[PDB]
mmCIF file of C-alpha atoms in Angstrom:
data_model
loop_
_atom_site.group_PDB
_atom_site.id
_atom_site.type_symbol
_atom_site.label_atom_id
_atom_site.label_comp_id
_atom_site.label_asym_id
_atom_site.label_seq_id
_atom_site.Cartn_x
_atom_site.Cartn_y
_atom_site.Cartn_z
ATOM 1 C CA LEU A 15 37.203 74.502 -98.905
ATOM 2 C CA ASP A 16 35.523 74.707 -95.490
ATOM 3 C CA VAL A 17 36.389 71.712 -93.340
ATOM 4 C CA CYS A 18 34.553 70.415 -90.279
ATOM 5 C CA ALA A 19 36.523 68.406 -87.713
ATOM 6 C CA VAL A 20 35.040 65.644 -85.542
ATOM 7 C CA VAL A 21 36.691 64.457 -82.296
ATOM 8 C CA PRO A 22 35.252 61.204 -80.861
ATOM 9 C CA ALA A 23 35.637 62.138 -77.174
ATOM 10 C CA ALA A 24 33.156 59.807 -75.476
ATOM 11 C CA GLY A 25 34.623 58.093 -72.392
ATOM 12 C CA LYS A 26 43.552 60.397 -70.805
ATOM 13 C CA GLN A 27 42.008 63.272 -72.790
ATOM 14 C CA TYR A 28 41.447 65.235 -69.571
ATOM 15 C CA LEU A 29 45.010 64.847 -68.276
ATOM 16 C CA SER A 30 46.964 68.101 -68.618
ATOM 17 C CA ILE A 31 50.148 69.161 -70.402
ATOM 18 C CA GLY A 32 51.268 72.593 -69.221
ATOM 19 C CA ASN A 33 47.931 74.236 -68.274
ATOM 20 C CA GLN A 34 45.746 72.752 -70.979
ATOM 21 C CA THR A 35 44.163 69.369 -71.124
ATOM 22 C CA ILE A 36 45.226 66.921 -73.781
ATOM 23 C CA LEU A 37 41.766 67.344 -75.404
ATOM 24 C CA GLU A 38 42.406 71.067 -75.695
ATOM 25 C CA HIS A 39 45.863 70.592 -77.194
ATOM 26 C CA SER A 40 44.346 68.173 -79.738
ATOM 27 C CA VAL A 41 41.527 70.588 -80.581
ATOM 28 C CA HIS A 42 43.815 73.577 -80.904
ATOM 29 C CA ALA A 43 46.149 71.557 -83.168
ATOM 30 C CA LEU A 44 43.192 71.163 -85.527
ATOM 31 C CA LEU A 45 42.345 74.848 -85.491
ATOM 32 C CA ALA A 46 45.846 75.762 -86.722
ATOM 33 C CA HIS A 47 44.676 75.372 -90.351
ATOM 34 C CA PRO A 48 42.326 78.186 -91.516
ATOM 35 C CA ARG A 49 40.066 75.758 -93.493
ATOM 36 C CA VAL A 50 39.047 74.110 -90.237
ATOM 37 C CA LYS A 51 36.016 76.242 -89.461
ATOM 38 C CA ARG A 52 34.396 74.087 -86.805
ATOM 39 C CA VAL A 53 35.263 71.234 -84.475
ATOM 40 C CA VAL A 54 32.481 68.896 -83.394
ATOM 41 C CA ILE A 55 33.317 67.137 -80.127
ATOM 42 C CA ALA A 56 31.331 63.980 -79.383
ATOM 43 C CA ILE A 57 31.070 63.460 -75.611
ATOM 44 C CA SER A 58 29.480 60.760 -73.486
ATOM 45 C CA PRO A 59 26.154 61.429 -71.703
ATOM 46 C CA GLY A 60 26.851 62.497 -68.105
ATOM 47 C CA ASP A 61 30.402 63.638 -68.905
ATOM 48 C CA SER A 62 30.516 66.819 -66.835
ATOM 49 C CA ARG A 63 34.231 67.492 -67.116
ATOM 50 C CA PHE A 64 33.985 68.848 -70.647
ATOM 51 C CA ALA A 65 31.719 71.707 -69.541
ATOM 52 C CA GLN A 66 34.420 72.918 -67.136
ATOM 53 C CA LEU A 67 37.107 73.431 -69.788
ATOM 54 C CA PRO A 68 37.513 76.903 -71.301
ATOM 55 C CA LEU A 69 37.250 75.138 -74.628
ATOM 56 C CA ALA A 70 33.564 74.657 -73.802
ATOM 57 C CA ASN A 71 32.903 78.335 -74.635
ATOM 58 C CA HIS A 72 34.867 78.405 -77.884
ATOM 59 C CA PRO A 73 32.669 79.789 -80.659
ATOM 60 C CA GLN A 74 34.028 77.282 -83.175
ATOM 61 C CA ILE A 75 33.343 74.225 -80.989
ATOM 62 C CA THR A 76 30.172 72.153 -81.261
ATOM 63 C CA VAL A 77 29.292 69.557 -78.600
ATOM 64 C CA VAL A 78 27.097 66.507 -79.194
ATOM 65 C CA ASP A 79 26.420 63.195 -77.456
ATOM 66 C CA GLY A 80 28.521 60.371 -78.865
ATOM 67 C CA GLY A 81 27.783 56.648 -78.615
ATOM 68 C CA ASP A 82 29.486 53.686 -76.966
ATOM 69 C CA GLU A 83 31.625 52.841 -80.008
ATOM 70 C CA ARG A 84 33.933 55.042 -82.089
ATOM 71 C CA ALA A 85 31.927 54.766 -85.310
ATOM 72 C CA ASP A 86 28.796 55.830 -83.472
ATOM 73 C CA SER A 87 30.461 58.934 -82.049
ATOM 74 C CA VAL A 88 31.817 59.858 -85.446
ATOM 75 C CA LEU A 89 28.391 59.458 -87.082
ATOM 76 C CA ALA A 90 26.975 61.694 -84.340
ATOM 77 C CA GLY A 91 29.611 64.329 -85.083
ATOM 78 C CA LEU A 92 28.882 64.202 -88.800
ATOM 79 C CA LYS A 93 25.219 65.131 -88.264
ATOM 80 C CA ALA A 94 26.534 68.468 -87.006
ATOM 81 C CA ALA A 95 29.087 68.914 -89.806
ATOM 82 C CA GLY A 96 26.746 71.236 -91.723
ATOM 83 C CA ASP A 97 27.517 71.706 -95.422
ATOM 84 C CA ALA A 98 31.278 71.047 -95.171
ATOM 85 C CA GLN A 99 32.234 68.793 -98.086
ATOM 86 C CA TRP A 100 35.218 67.302 -96.293
ATOM 87 C CA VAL A 101 35.536 66.075 -92.736
ATOM 88 C CA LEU A 102 38.565 65.588 -90.475
ATOM 89 C CA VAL A 103 38.351 62.918 -87.767
ATOM 90 C CA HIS A 104 40.890 63.321 -85.004
ATOM 91 C CA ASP A 105 41.633 61.516 -81.762
ATOM 92 C CA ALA A 106 40.941 63.324 -78.529
ATOM 93 C CA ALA A 107 44.192 61.957 -77.063
ATOM 94 C CA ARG A 108 46.621 62.988 -79.829
ATOM 95 C CA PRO A 109 47.853 66.369 -78.630
ATOM 96 C CA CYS A 110 51.141 66.370 -80.591
ATOM 97 C CA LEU A 111 49.594 66.871 -84.044
ATOM 98 C CA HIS A 112 51.906 69.143 -86.108
ATOM 99 C CA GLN A 113 50.538 71.888 -88.389
ATOM 100 C CA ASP A 114 52.765 70.808 -91.317
ATOM 101 C CA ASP A 115 51.289 67.307 -91.297
ATOM 102 C CA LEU A 116 47.751 68.687 -91.009
ATOM 103 C CA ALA A 117 48.429 71.054 -93.906
ATOM 104 C CA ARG A 118 49.767 68.255 -96.053
ATOM 105 C CA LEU A 119 46.804 66.021 -95.257
ATOM 106 C CA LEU A 120 44.310 68.718 -96.230
ATOM 107 C CA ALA A 121 45.799 68.853 -99.752
ATOM 108 C CA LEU A 122 44.185 65.462 -100.412
ATOM 109 C CA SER A 123 40.894 67.193 -101.086
ATOM 110 C CA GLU A 124 42.198 68.957 -104.188
ATOM 111 C CA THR A 125 42.838 65.652 -105.922
ATOM 112 C CA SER A 126 41.550 62.722 -103.869
ATOM 113 C CA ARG A 127 38.201 61.068 -104.448
ATOM 114 C CA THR A 128 38.432 58.893 -101.319
ATOM 115 C CA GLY A 129 40.644 60.847 -98.919
ATOM 116 C CA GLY A 130 43.321 59.490 -96.655
ATOM 117 C CA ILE A 131 44.983 59.474 -93.278
ATOM 118 C CA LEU A 132 48.164 60.562 -91.555
ATOM 119 C CA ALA A 133 50.384 57.536 -91.008
ATOM 120 C CA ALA A 134 53.894 56.555 -89.866
ATOM 121 C CA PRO A 135 55.935 53.712 -91.380
ATOM 122 C CA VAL A 136 56.880 50.877 -89.044
ATOM 123 C CA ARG A 137 60.640 51.235 -88.602
ATOM 124 C CA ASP A 138 61.397 49.139 -85.513
ATOM 125 C CA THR A 139 60.846 45.452 -84.791
ATOM 126 C CA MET A 140 57.265 44.275 -84.270
ATOM 127 C CA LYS A 141 56.019 40.908 -83.032
ATOM 128 C CA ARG A 142 52.697 39.058 -83.230
ATOM 129 C CA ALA A 143 52.058 37.101 -80.039
ATOM 130 C CA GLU A 144 50.556 33.623 -79.866
ATOM 131 C CA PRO A 145 46.782 33.965 -79.432
ATOM 132 C CA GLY A 146 45.929 33.671 -75.747
ATOM 133 C CA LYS A 147 49.555 33.923 -74.678
ATOM 134 C CA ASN A 148 52.284 36.489 -74.008
ATOM 135 C CA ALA A 149 54.791 34.677 -76.159
ATOM 136 C CA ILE A 150 56.015 35.503 -79.628
ATOM 137 C CA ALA A 151 54.385 33.786 -82.595
ATOM 138 C CA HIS A 152 56.446 35.514 -85.271
ATOM 139 C CA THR A 153 58.171 38.737 -86.323
ATOM 140 C CA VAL A 154 56.133 41.006 -88.616
ATOM 141 C CA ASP A 155 57.539 42.201 -91.951
ATOM 142 C CA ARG A 156 57.557 46.007 -91.880
ATOM 143 C CA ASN A 157 57.539 46.398 -95.633
ATOM 144 C CA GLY A 158 54.399 48.355 -96.420
ATOM 145 C CA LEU A 159 53.337 48.338 -92.746
ATOM 146 C CA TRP A 160 52.064 51.638 -91.401
ATOM 147 C CA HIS A 161 50.788 52.950 -88.079
ATOM 148 C CA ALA A 162 47.391 54.572 -88.708
ATOM 149 C CA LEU A 163 47.463 57.988 -87.059
ATOM 150 C CA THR A 164 44.838 60.760 -87.009
ATOM 151 C CA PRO A 165 43.502 62.962 -88.469
ATOM 152 C CA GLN A 166 41.719 60.935 -91.078
ATOM 153 C CA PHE A 167 40.299 63.105 -93.857
ATOM 154 C CA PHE A 168 37.398 62.141 -96.110
ATOM 155 C CA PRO A 169 34.532 63.526 -98.158
ATOM 156 C CA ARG A 170 31.639 63.987 -95.760
ATOM 157 C CA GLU A 171 28.913 62.015 -97.524
ATOM 158 C CA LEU A 172 31.150 59.120 -98.477
ATOM 159 C CA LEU A 173 32.431 58.735 -94.916
ATOM 160 C CA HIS A 174 28.848 58.875 -93.708
ATOM 161 C CA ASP A 175 27.602 56.169 -96.053
ATOM 162 C CA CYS A 176 30.553 53.836 -95.516
ATOM 163 C CA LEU A 177 30.304 54.005 -91.742
ATOM 164 C CA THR A 178 26.539 53.529 -91.806
ATOM 165 C CA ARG A 179 26.997 50.543 -94.131
ATOM 166 C CA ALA A 180 29.864 48.964 -92.198
ATOM 167 C CA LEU A 181 27.902 49.226 -88.936
ATOM 168 C CA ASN A 182 24.728 47.940 -90.587
ATOM 169 C CA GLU A 183 26.548 44.862 -91.874
ATOM 170 C CA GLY A 184 28.206 44.101 -88.541
ATOM 171 C CA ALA A 185 31.571 45.121 -89.988
ATOM 172 C CA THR A 186 34.556 45.282 -87.664
ATOM 173 C CA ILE A 187 35.502 48.962 -87.701
ATOM 174 C CA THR A 188 38.333 50.503 -85.729
ATOM 175 C CA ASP A 189 39.283 53.729 -87.496
ATOM 176 C CA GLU A 190 37.454 55.650 -90.191
ATOM 177 C CA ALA A 191 39.722 54.378 -92.948
ATOM 178 C CA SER A 192 38.531 50.894 -92.020
ATOM 179 C CA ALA A 193 34.968 51.863 -93.008
ATOM 180 C CA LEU A 194 36.091 53.011 -96.405
ATOM 181 C CA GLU A 195 38.189 49.918 -96.828
ATOM 182 C CA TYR A 196 35.210 47.722 -96.028
ATOM 183 C CA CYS A 197 33.189 49.441 -98.751
ATOM 184 C CA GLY A 198 35.985 48.711 -101.229
ATOM 185 C CA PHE A 199 38.016 51.873 -101.103
ATOM 186 C CA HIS A 200 41.745 52.277 -100.533
ATOM 187 C CA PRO A 201 42.462 55.532 -98.701
ATOM 188 C CA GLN A 202 45.766 57.245 -99.228
ATOM 189 C CA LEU A 203 48.590 57.141 -96.702
ATOM 190 C CA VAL A 204 50.103 60.558 -95.989
ATOM 191 C CA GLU A 205 53.328 60.136 -94.095
ATOM 192 C CA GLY A 206 53.353 62.104 -90.881
ATOM 193 C CA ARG A 207 55.648 62.477 -87.906
ATOM 194 C CA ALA A 208 56.049 59.444 -85.643
ATOM 195 C CA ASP A 209 55.749 61.578 -82.521
ATOM 196 C CA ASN A 210 52.016 62.159 -83.157
ATOM 197 C CA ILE A 211 51.351 59.744 -80.325
ATOM 198 C CA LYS A 212 48.014 58.699 -78.914
ATOM 199 C CA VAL A 213 48.312 59.016 -75.129
ATOM 200 C CA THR A 214 46.916 55.710 -73.882
ATOM 201 C CA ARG A 215 49.403 54.321 -71.306
ATOM 202 C CA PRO A 216 50.115 56.284 -68.120
ATOM 203 C CA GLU A 217 53.700 56.844 -69.126
ATOM 204 C CA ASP A 218 52.544 58.241 -72.493
ATOM 205 C CA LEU A 219 51.797 61.585 -70.878
ATOM 206 C CA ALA A 220 55.444 62.216 -70.004
ATOM 207 C CA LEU A 221 56.356 60.905 -73.473
ATOM 208 C CA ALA A 222 53.939 63.301 -75.122
ATOM 209 C CA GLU A 223 55.335 66.140 -73.045
ATOM 210 C CA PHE A 224 58.892 65.192 -74.018
ATOM 211 C CA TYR A 225 57.908 65.248 -77.735
ATOM 212 C CA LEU A 226 56.254 68.674 -77.501
ATOM 213 C CA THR A 227 59.182 70.170 -75.581
ATOM 214 C CA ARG A 228 61.695 68.724 -78.021
ATOM 215 C CA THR A 229 59.714 70.075 -81.001
ATOM 216 C CA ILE A 230 59.314 73.549 -79.471
ATOM 217 C CA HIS A 231 63.069 73.543 -78.844
ATOM 218 C CA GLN A 232 63.946 72.295 -82.365
ATOM 219 C CA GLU A 233 61.898 75.060 -83.910
ATOM 220 C CA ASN A 234 64.732 77.556 -83.325
ATOM 221 C CA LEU B 8 71.901 33.764 -62.316
ATOM 222 C CA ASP B 9 74.976 36.012 -62.642
ATOM 223 C CA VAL B 10 74.226 37.816 -65.897
ATOM 224 C CA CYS B 11 76.560 39.115 -68.601
ATOM 225 C CA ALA B 12 75.107 41.818 -70.898
ATOM 226 C CA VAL B 13 76.045 42.452 -74.531
ATOM 227 C CA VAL B 14 75.633 45.839 -76.238
ATOM 228 C CA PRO B 15 76.396 45.855 -79.971
ATOM 229 C CA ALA B 16 77.883 49.280 -80.806
ATOM 230 C CA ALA B 17 78.925 47.984 -84.249
ATOM 231 C CA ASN B 18 76.658 59.349 -78.832
ATOM 232 C CA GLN B 19 79.341 58.066 -76.391
ATOM 233 C CA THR B 20 77.294 59.525 -73.542
ATOM 234 C CA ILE B 21 74.136 57.779 -74.898
ATOM 235 C CA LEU B 22 75.989 54.392 -74.939
ATOM 236 C CA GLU B 23 77.313 55.192 -71.485
ATOM 237 C CA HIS B 24 73.920 55.860 -69.995
ATOM 238 C CA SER B 25 72.453 52.727 -71.590
ATOM 239 C CA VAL B 26 75.350 50.692 -70.209
ATOM 240 C CA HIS B 27 75.020 52.035 -66.689
ATOM 241 C CA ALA B 28 71.271 51.349 -66.705
ATOM 242 C CA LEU B 29 72.147 47.686 -67.219
ATOM 243 C CA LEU B 30 74.948 47.683 -64.686
ATOM 244 C CA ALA B 31 72.592 49.176 -62.080
ATOM 245 C CA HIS B 32 70.980 45.783 -61.348
ATOM 246 C CA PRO B 33 72.992 43.557 -58.937
ATOM 247 C CA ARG B 34 72.871 40.386 -61.125
ATOM 248 C CA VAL B 35 74.350 42.225 -64.092
ATOM 249 C CA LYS B 36 78.053 41.954 -63.286
ATOM 250 C CA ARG B 37 79.548 43.032 -66.588
ATOM 251 C CA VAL B 38 78.752 44.527 -69.961
ATOM 252 C CA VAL B 39 80.378 43.487 -73.201
ATOM 253 C CA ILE B 40 80.453 46.196 -75.848
ATOM 254 C CA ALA B 41 80.817 44.792 -79.348
ATOM 255 C CA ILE B 42 82.612 47.299 -81.538
ATOM 256 C CA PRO B 43 86.994 56.048 -71.309
ATOM 257 C CA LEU B 44 83.862 53.959 -71.051
ATOM 258 C CA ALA B 45 86.132 51.091 -72.072
ATOM 259 C CA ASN B 46 88.233 51.844 -68.972
ATOM 260 C CA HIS B 47 85.432 50.802 -66.683
ATOM 261 C CA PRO B 48 86.327 47.622 -64.748
ATOM 262 C CA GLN B 49 82.885 46.206 -65.606
ATOM 263 C CA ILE B 50 83.075 46.899 -69.344
ATOM 264 C CA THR B 51 84.640 44.548 -71.912
ATOM 265 C CA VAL B 52 85.219 45.346 -75.572
ATOM 266 C CA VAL B 53 85.259 42.847 -78.442
ATOM 267 C CA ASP B 54 85.315 43.147 -82.220
ATOM 268 C CA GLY B 55 81.769 43.597 -83.468
ATOM 269 C CA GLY B 56 81.010 42.346 -86.982
ATOM 270 C CA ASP B 57 79.186 43.924 -89.901
ATOM 271 C CA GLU B 58 75.775 42.660 -88.770
ATOM 272 C CA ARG B 59 74.065 43.130 -85.327
ATOM 273 C CA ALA B 60 73.755 39.327 -85.032
ATOM 274 C CA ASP B 61 77.495 38.881 -85.554
ATOM 275 C CA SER B 62 78.385 41.542 -83.003
ATOM 276 C CA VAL B 63 76.132 39.801 -80.482
ATOM 277 C CA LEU B 64 77.752 36.416 -81.182
ATOM 278 C CA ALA B 65 81.152 38.068 -80.778
ATOM 279 C CA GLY B 66 79.966 39.363 -77.456
ATOM 280 C CA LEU B 67 79.023 35.845 -76.487
ATOM 281 C CA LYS B 68 82.633 34.661 -76.739
ATOM 282 C CA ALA B 69 83.430 37.242 -74.052
ATOM 283 C CA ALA B 70 80.589 36.323 -71.664
ATOM 284 C CA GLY B 71 82.576 33.837 -69.550
ATOM 285 C CA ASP B 72 80.573 31.349 -67.517
ATOM 286 C CA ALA B 73 77.348 33.408 -67.765
ATOM 287 C CA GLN B 74 74.341 31.108 -67.975
ATOM 288 C CA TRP B 75 71.986 33.900 -69.070
ATOM 289 C CA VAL B 76 72.729 36.868 -71.311
ATOM 290 C CA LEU B 77 71.072 40.272 -71.660
ATOM 291 C CA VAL B 78 71.250 41.945 -75.067
ATOM 292 C CA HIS B 79 70.509 45.686 -75.090
ATOM 293 C CA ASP B 80 70.351 48.422 -77.716
ATOM 294 C CA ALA B 81 72.990 51.093 -77.214
ATOM 295 C CA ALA B 82 70.363 53.734 -78.030
ATOM 296 C CA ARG B 83 67.859 52.917 -75.242
ATOM 297 C CA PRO B 84 69.143 54.786 -72.178
ATOM 298 C CA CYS B 85 65.716 55.323 -70.678
ATOM 299 C CA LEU B 86 65.439 51.751 -69.415
ATOM 300 C CA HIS B 87 63.684 51.625 -66.021
ATOM 301 C CA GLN B 88 64.966 49.295 -63.275
ATOM 302 C CA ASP B 89 61.522 47.813 -62.608
ATOM 303 C CA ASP B 90 61.294 46.644 -66.231
ATOM 304 C CA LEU B 91 64.793 45.166 -66.086
ATOM 305 C CA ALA B 92 63.851 43.353 -62.882
ATOM 306 C CA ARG B 93 60.710 41.860 -64.330
ATOM 307 C CA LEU B 94 62.712 40.668 -67.338
ATOM 308 C CA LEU B 95 65.535 39.099 -65.298
ATOM 309 C CA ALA B 96 62.927 37.144 -63.355
ATOM 310 C CA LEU B 97 62.459 34.946 -66.433
ATOM 311 C CA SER B 98 65.567 32.950 -65.529
ATOM 312 C CA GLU B 99 63.608 31.511 -62.611
ATOM 313 C CA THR B 100 60.960 29.865 -64.761
ATOM 314 C CA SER B 101 61.856 30.076 -68.451
ATOM 315 C CA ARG B 102 63.641 27.624 -70.759
ATOM 316 C CA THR B 103 63.560 30.061 -73.724
ATOM 317 C CA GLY B 104 63.906 33.598 -72.364
ATOM 318 C CA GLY B 105 61.970 36.661 -73.451
ATOM 319 C CA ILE B 106 62.001 40.304 -74.346
ATOM 320 C CA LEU B 107 60.765 43.644 -73.136
ATOM 321 C CA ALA B 108 57.805 44.663 -75.229
ATOM 322 C CA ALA B 109 54.987 47.205 -75.476
ATOM 323 C CA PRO B 110 51.526 46.714 -77.039
ATOM 324 C CA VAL B 111 50.902 48.635 -80.251
ATOM 325 C CA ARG B 112 48.567 51.581 -79.744
ATOM 326 C CA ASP B 113 47.325 52.244 -83.272
ATOM 327 C CA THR B 114 45.209 50.704 -85.919
ATOM 328 C CA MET B 115 47.627 49.243 -88.442
ATOM 329 C CA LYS B 116 47.550 49.270 -92.246
ATOM 330 C CA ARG B 117 49.247 47.318 -95.016
ATOM 331 C CA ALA B 118 49.892 49.500 -98.049
ATOM 332 C CA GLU B 119 49.167 48.377 -101.588
ATOM 333 C CA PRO B 120 52.383 47.170 -103.215
ATOM 334 C CA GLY B 121 53.676 50.077 -105.267
ATOM 335 C CA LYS B 122 51.472 52.773 -103.743
ATOM 336 C CA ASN B 123 50.880 54.961 -100.702
ATOM 337 C CA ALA B 124 47.400 53.592 -100.391
ATOM 338 C CA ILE B 125 45.838 51.180 -97.977
ATOM 339 C CA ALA B 126 45.365 47.590 -99.122
ATOM 340 C CA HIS B 127 43.926 46.411 -95.832
ATOM 341 C CA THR B 128 43.890 46.879 -92.070
ATOM 342 C CA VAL B 129 46.178 44.646 -90.017
ATOM 343 C CA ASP B 130 44.689 43.551 -86.687
ATOM 344 C CA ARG B 131 46.577 45.329 -83.919
ATOM 345 C CA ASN B 132 45.350 42.859 -81.339
ATOM 346 C CA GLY B 133 48.322 40.697 -80.296
ATOM 347 C CA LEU B 134 50.836 42.986 -81.971
ATOM 348 C CA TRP B 135 53.786 44.268 -79.931
ATOM 349 C CA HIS B 136 56.678 46.691 -80.241
ATOM 350 C CA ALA B 137 59.808 44.605 -79.605
ATOM 351 C CA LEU B 138 62.046 46.454 -77.179
ATOM 352 C CA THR B 139 65.322 45.649 -75.387
ATOM 353 C CA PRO B 140 66.868 44.171 -73.293
ATOM 354 C CA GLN B 141 66.331 40.720 -74.660
ATOM 355 C CA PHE B 142 67.172 38.012 -72.107
ATOM 356 C CA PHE B 143 68.125 34.431 -72.927
ATOM 357 C CA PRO B 144 69.947 31.302 -71.834
ATOM 358 C CA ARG B 145 73.534 31.535 -73.033
ATOM 359 C CA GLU B 146 73.804 28.310 -75.006
ATOM 360 C CA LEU B 147 70.396 28.587 -76.623
ATOM 361 C CA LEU B 148 71.045 32.131 -77.824
ATOM 362 C CA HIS B 149 74.457 31.117 -79.072
ATOM 363 C CA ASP B 150 73.213 28.051 -80.934
ATOM 364 C CA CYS B 151 70.194 29.681 -82.509
ATOM 365 C CA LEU B 152 72.143 32.767 -83.551
ATOM 366 C CA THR B 153 74.879 30.665 -85.078
ATOM 367 C CA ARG B 154 72.459 28.411 -86.925
ATOM 368 C CA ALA B 155 70.072 31.113 -88.158
ATOM 369 C CA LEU B 156 72.969 33.156 -89.514
ATOM 370 C CA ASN B 157 74.642 30.246 -91.290
ATOM 371 C CA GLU B 158 71.262 29.401 -92.815
ATOM 372 C CA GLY B 159 70.754 32.900 -94.184
ATOM 373 C CA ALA B 160 67.887 33.824 -91.876
ATOM 374 C CA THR B 161 66.766 37.455 -91.854
ATOM 375 C CA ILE B 162 67.649 38.397 -88.299
ATOM 376 C CA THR B 163 66.280 41.560 -86.785
ATOM 377 C CA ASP B 164 66.536 41.164 -83.025
ATOM 378 C CA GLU B 165 67.863 38.232 -81.000
ATOM 379 C CA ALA B 166 64.389 36.849 -80.476
ATOM 380 C CA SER B 167 64.070 36.454 -84.257
ATOM 381 C CA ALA B 168 66.987 33.975 -84.246
ATOM 382 C CA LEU B 169 65.162 31.918 -81.670
ATOM 383 C CA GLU B 170 62.038 32.242 -83.766
ATOM 384 C CA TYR B 171 63.819 30.942 -86.845
ATOM 385 C CA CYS B 172 64.843 27.784 -85.016
ATOM 386 C CA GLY B 173 61.342 27.226 -83.685
ATOM 387 C CA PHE B 174 61.394 28.701 -80.212
ATOM 388 C CA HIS B 175 58.932 31.272 -78.873
ATOM 389 C CA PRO B 176 60.397 33.792 -76.451
ATOM 390 C CA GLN B 177 58.181 35.399 -73.838
ATOM 391 C CA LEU B 178 56.754 38.883 -74.144
ATOM 392 C CA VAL B 179 57.396 40.811 -70.952
ATOM 393 C CA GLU B 180 55.326 43.974 -70.850
ATOM 394 C CA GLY B 181 57.569 46.963 -70.327
ATOM 395 C CA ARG B 182 57.140 50.726 -70.291
ATOM 396 C CA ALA B 183 56.401 52.377 -73.651
ATOM 397 C CA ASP B 184 58.746 55.235 -72.784
ATOM 398 C CA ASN B 185 61.743 52.917 -73.190
ATOM 399 C CA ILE B 186 62.404 54.773 -76.405
ATOM 400 C CA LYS B 187 65.327 54.947 -78.807
ATOM 401 C CA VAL B 188 67.333 58.136 -78.147
ATOM 402 C CA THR B 189 69.466 58.600 -81.259
ATOM 403 C CA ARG B 190 70.326 62.298 -81.196
ATOM 404 C CA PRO B 191 72.725 63.219 -78.387
ATOM 405 C CA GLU B 192 70.988 66.553 -78.099
ATOM 406 C CA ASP B 193 67.832 64.765 -76.951
ATOM 407 C CA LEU B 194 69.353 62.795 -74.113
ATOM 408 C CA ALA B 195 69.116 65.233 -71.209
ATOM 409 C CA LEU B 196 65.553 66.089 -72.188
ATOM 410 C CA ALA B 197 64.516 62.470 -72.602
ATOM 411 C CA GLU B 198 66.152 61.674 -69.298
ATOM 412 C CA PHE B 199 64.431 64.542 -67.464
ATOM 413 C CA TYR B 200 60.928 63.547 -68.627
ATOM 414 C CA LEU B 201 61.152 59.752 -68.889
ATOM 415 C CA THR B 202 63.815 58.800 -66.338
#
């Protein structure tokens, strides 16, 4: 049941919450589960900041050069995934990952042949804008609509082949699930907490910090 | 450009903070709460209905001579004054109005019917979280809300009533920390980090 994690970190991840970078909170969230034996971080050539983090001397961390696109970084991480049968792909900028959700995602390997992702149901109103304009086209129906979160958990070889194939066919890949979907698979949706935010807007840092503080508080 | 706001409240400190965030802007002279806060000279109370749309219409009958109306969620007390200002600016140029909104950050999936499995990816480009306030010309909001409701439209926010009748409100990019605070125990904390 060894698992290897891959973090596509090639470029917010170096912003800090408390006295750890967001990348470090994300990485340590992964290491909470004992089955996660290694974390491969894909970093961009020339990125010198990584080497300065204490995480850079962690015996369970592997560092490799990623590419310009997500799928390329992930493929680069997978070459260093050793003999792990299952791989976890997790966003560098998702520091609020909860151990309970990780644990429940990792159960997919006992029974799943495809794997699956953490996800959050859409529960508030969403709009689709007119193309080219900041005006509303229509309101989206939330029934069966999910936010794709990370981690995304898949058999190693299958992920590998689907991503290689999607890229080789010019497929339009965003997340890892999209590569499986393109090769005809239907990954499972594992409901996770909606506060597993990707820090992408400047105000998201304070939001992430609010969510971690509230959670620490609640646990008691 | 005097503005009347409507808050459908059909947890008292959360409503209170949301209300005073609206009242903070000079153009916002009054708030109508559709249902001690009620003893504020700037706060009006009316009967809210069973649906949000009906409470908002009920607020409209209390809005006086207001030419433009702000509709705000009672559970969004982390509204920032710069976002409110950029929204109110629509009255200078818009015939339709618009809403506060934030771009969606994640890849999006549509689940297979009947299963917790992905059918397909939904393109997140051009997809927005609809926030509040929602800001519209008085008569237009009134007329679209009334008509959509009588026609059995599925109304979510106010913009959706305009949508039903064929209008396309503007998307005004706001802060993504303008979150829903629904547990009272979270308010001080949300306010300390996001206010």
